[PDB]
Write an enzyme that holds these catalytic residues in place. Structure first.
Site, PDB file in Angstrom:
ATOM      1  N   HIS A   1      33.036  66.306  42.764  1.00 62.25           N
ATOM      2  CA  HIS A   1      33.138  65.984  41.608  1.00 62.25           C
ATOM      3  C   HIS A   1      32.113  64.483  41.253  1.00 62.25           C
ATOM      4  CE1 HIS A   1      33.985  65.557  37.239  1.00 62.25           C
ATOM      5  NE2 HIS A   1      33.951  64.776  36.911  1.00 62.25           N
TER       6      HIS A   1
ATOM      7  N   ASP B   1      33.228  60.088  33.046  1.00 58.36           N
ATOM      8  CA  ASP B   1      34.047  61.301  34.044  1.00 58.36           C
ATOM      9  C   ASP B   1      34.280  62.043  32.743  1.00 58.36           C
ATOM     10  OD1 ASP B   1      34.999  63.498  35.245  1.00 58.36           O
ATOM     11  OD2 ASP B   1      37.184  62.204  36.942  1.00 58.36           O
TER      12      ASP B   1
ATOM     13  N   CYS C   1      29.441  69.451  35.916  1.00 55.75           N
ATOM     14  CA  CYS C   1      29.914  68.000  36.011  1.00 55.75           C
ATOM     15  C   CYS C   1      28.670  67.289  36.065  1.00 55.75           C
ATOM     16  CB  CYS C   1      30.670  67.577  36.909  1.00 55.75           C
ATOM     17  SG  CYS C   1      30.408  68.328  38.728  1.00 55.75           S
TER      18      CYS C   1
ATOM     19  N   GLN D   1      34.570  67.637  30.301  1.00 54.40           N
ATOM     20  CA  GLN D   1      33.579  68.735  29.998  1.00 54.40           C
ATOM     21  C   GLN D   1      34.901  69.480  29.847  1.00 54.40           C
ATOM     22  OE1 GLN D   1      33.129  68.036  34.587  1.00 54.40           O
ATOM     23  NE2 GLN D   1      33.122  70.476  35.110  1.00 54.40           N
TER      24      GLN D   1
END
Ligand SMILES: [Br-]
Ligand SMILES: [Br-]
Ligand SMILES: [Br-]
Ligand SMILES: [Cl-]
Ligand SMILES: [K+]
Ligand SMILES: [K+]
EC number: 3.4.19.12
Lengths: 227, 76, 76
Positions: A166, A181, A92, A86
């Site tokens: 998130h 992630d 996200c 990211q």
């Protein structure tokens, strides 16, 4: 570069996947609770869970310690995992959906001119950082994300507002449960799972997030279920 | 009468309500107790999503019934 | 002048408008053509949701500009 944050709403995520040209063999559903009775309401099979959670100071000390332990001590990550970093504030939502589809590519069908199909074909051999730079520059997904951010039961916030919530994706690849992630430097291997037990095994990871932050209620899980 | 609202975290919120109370009223009571804005709330009873303008009575929600709260939060 | 409104289905609604028209006026015109109540309508131009009391002129919306229509969900 700064995007709008997406609502944790299966209607929004299913519409987003339709605009990206995914055939609707799979649809997101809400998870109402983590006990067997409420989990029995999720249609099977499930090939992904998206978890919305809060980035608190307590979360950040655990993330810091986890990263330091895995860098210095090692972990197994199968070569089959599709991971992207990211590099865009508030993307996200998009990165979670790409993680969910990219790691189930064999179960997914795409329409003529699918923008997500084109993204996945072009990024197949890219490093996680190159995939992140490619998404920065990928207009068709940026404008679809933009539209999707204005959908849902709530109004989109101002692009200047700080977001402390998130999205992450939980998938089964090659016998193991991976947390994907884009804010971390690698997938996180959470141990053994199978196609038949992914929902239960993913929800056990989600439980650990909630127990590390016992005073927080700001959590939402959606399951990608066979339609 | 007392009713229970369970979150995804498995936390139980106890509310004091009347059968004539609307789903909007219940969401206002949850905002009072937990500080979650009503626009982010989605209430479920018996596997069915509840509408704002209807009463607890409309859904046969009685003393010590358990509702489920899903939060429509936005994430980056 | 003519402007275009694209829906999630990809369909185009064509409206006759003036620069001085308010966002409320445009929503009324969409209700006339498609029967969507104004309170459910969100109009998007240049990635920004448009406010009811402002004019097309306020947002530099010109002849043959394309807006996007999204529907606010009711929740509950
Ligand atoms: Br299954
Ligand atoms: Br109360
Ligand atoms: Br809704
Ligand atoms: Cl697969
Ligand atoms: K790969
Ligand atoms: K998989």
């Amino acid at each position: 570069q700064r995007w709008l944050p997406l609502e944790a709403n299966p209607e929004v995520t299913n519409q987003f996947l339709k605009q990206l040209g995914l055939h609707p063999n799979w649809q997101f559903v809400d998870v109402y609770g983590m006990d067997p009775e409420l989990l029995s309401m999720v249609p099977r099979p499930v090939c992904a869970v998206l978890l919305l959670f809060p980035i608190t100071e307590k979360y950040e000390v655990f993330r810091t310690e986890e990263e330091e332990k895995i860098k210095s001590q090692g972990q197994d990550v199968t070569s089959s995992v599709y991971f992207m970093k990211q590099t865009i504030s508030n993307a996200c939502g998009t990165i979670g959906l790409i993680h969910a589809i990219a790691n189930n590519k064999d179960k997914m069908h795409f329409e003529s001119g699918s923008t997500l199909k084109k993204f996945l074909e072009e990024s197949v051999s890219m490093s996680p950082e190159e995939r992140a730079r490619y998404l920065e520059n990928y207009d068709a997904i940026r404008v679809t994300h933009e539209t999707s951010a204005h959908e849902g039961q709530t109004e989109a916030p101002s692009i200047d507002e700080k977001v402390d919530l998130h999205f992450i994706a939980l998938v089964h690849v090659d016998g193991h449960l991976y947390e994907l992630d884009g804010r971390k430097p690698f997938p996180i291997n959470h141990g053994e799972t199978s196609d038949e037990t992914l929902l239960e095994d993913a929800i056990e990871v989600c439980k650990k997030f909630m127990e590390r932050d016992p005073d927080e209620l700001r959590f939402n899980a959606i399951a990608l279920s066979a339609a | 009468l007392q009713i229970f609202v369970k979150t995804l975290t498995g936390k139980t919120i106890t509310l004091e309500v009347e059968p004539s109370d609307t789903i909007e009223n219940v969401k206002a009571k949850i905002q009072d107790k937990e500080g979650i804005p009503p626009d982010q709330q989605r209430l479920i009873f018996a596997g069915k999503q509840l509408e704002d303008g209807r009463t607890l009575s409309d859904y046969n929600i009685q003393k010590e019934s358990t509702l489920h709260l899903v939060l429509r939060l936005r994430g980056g």
